[PDB]
């Protein structure tokens, strides 16, 4: 009866209910580290050579 890895956090922190209401604050971190890798990079890839900072190297030559 080998179970699957559900109970990572059932015992230590998400049992005292402390980190259940704290994960909105303690758990606010590093996903605006992780989703520039999404939306921003998908945006400049669909529009390649069409934005200003693509073409601005021409008149920025002083």
């Amino acid at each position: 009866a080998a179970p699957t890895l559900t109970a990572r956090l059932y015992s230590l922190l998400f049992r005292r209910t402390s980190t259940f209401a704290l994960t909105i604050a303690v758990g606010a971190l590093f996903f605006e580290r992780a989703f520039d890798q999404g939306a921003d990079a998908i945006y400049e890839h669909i529009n390649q050579g069409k934005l200003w900072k693509h073409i601005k190297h021409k008149y920025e030559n002083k």
């Binding site: 945006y43 669909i46 529009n47 069409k50 934005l51 200003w52 073409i55």
Partner: peptide, 13 residues
């Protein structure tokens, strides 16, 4: 037109 997509930008040249 090249800006007629749901995520398509305007051509700035």
């Amino acid at each position: 037109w090249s800006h007629r997509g749901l995520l398509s930008s305007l051509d700035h040249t």
